[PDB]
Structure 1
Amino acid sequence: MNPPPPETSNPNKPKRQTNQLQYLLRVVLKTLWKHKFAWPFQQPVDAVKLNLPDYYKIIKTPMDMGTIKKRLENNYYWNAQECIQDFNTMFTNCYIYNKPGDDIVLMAEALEKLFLQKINELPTEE
């Protein structure tokens, strides 16, 4: 079985919007989401459908851009660092689970490169 997906809201977690969080949704996530290689990362890994019975034996901190998108839309994060951590977790999971130089790894590496280019212009907190 698949695990439940990561939460995208939590009534006990303080919510916030900041201009860096806006930029993460409006520019960074937008750019990655529309990229040709986004598709394997737009939703939680369906280990059942993909026949990966060991995926969640190995990956205990799953993350995907669909979750990140909903979190941003829900103002789930307190700061940009929390969101950046989620992107980094998503990339890292892909590197942990897959052989180096598998096509999925190259895709994640391309998205990570673009991610860093886009966050290079993250605005100051105003």
Structure 2
Amino acid sequence: SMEQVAMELRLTELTRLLRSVLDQLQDKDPARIFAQPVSLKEVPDYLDHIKHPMDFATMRKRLEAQGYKNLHEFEEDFDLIIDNCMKYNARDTVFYRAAVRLRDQGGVVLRQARREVDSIG
């Protein structure tokens, strides 16, 4: 149908906007602490602590399959990255501190993303 196509064009354009959002958020992680999944070879107990691991490469795979239907879903995954780190790592660690800075800096980006998603529809 033509309606299915229009819907698919809308998902494609959201994917475009989320890709640019993703790039902006990942620039706020210049140390690349959140770039890849925590290694279960190097942290064998990780899944006993963290039930839903997340990282920027895993988001990018979901994104490119057009697997985010709305901004809320994308933000859920970004919050997992931050929140998982803040639980597993103590306050005095470079990892925890990196997550705090990513959260604070990402907030600005996500604020305008929401406006753009509503504005363009």
Shared fold per TM-score greater than 0.5: yes
Q: Write out aligned runs for 1:1-126 (5 A).
A: 17=11, 19-26=13-20, 28-48=21-41, 50=42, 52-122=43-113, 123=116, 124=118, 125-126=120-121
Code of the residue aligned with 2:17 in structure 1: it is Y
Structure 1 residues 91 and 36 mapped into 2: Cα distance closer, same or farther (>3 Å)? closer
Q: CA RMSD in A?
A: 2.0
**Where do 5+ consecutive residues of structure 1 fail to align?**
1-14
TM-score, length basis structure 2: 0.78
What secondary structure is seen at the aligned counterpart in 2 of 1:32? Answer: helix
Larger RCO of the pair (alpha carbons < 8 Å, separation 6+): 1
Flag the structure with larger Rg: 2
TM-score, length basis structure 1: 0.76
What secondary structure is seen at the aligned counterpart in 2 of 1:53? Answer: coil
**Where do 5+ consecutive residues of structure 2 fail to align?**
1-7
- The offset of 1:63, in angstroms, is 0.6
Q: Is the 8 A contact 1:91 1:108 kept in 2?
A: yes
Q: Is the 8 A contact 1:94 1:105 kept in 2?
A: yes
Structure 1 residues 91 and 63 mapped into 2: Cα distance closer, same or farther (>3 Å)? same
Code of the residue aligned with 1:101 in structure 2: it is D
Q: Which structure has more helix as a fraction of its residues? A: 2
Q: Is the 8 A contact 1:37 1:107 kept in 2?
A: no
C-alpha distance in 1 between matches for 2:27 and 2:37 = 17
Kindly, what percent of the aligned residue pairs are identical? Answer: 32
Code of the residue aligned with 1:24 in structure 2: it is L
Code of the residue aligned with 2:110 in structure 1: it is I
Q: Is the 8 A contact 1:21 1:72 kept in 2?
A: yes
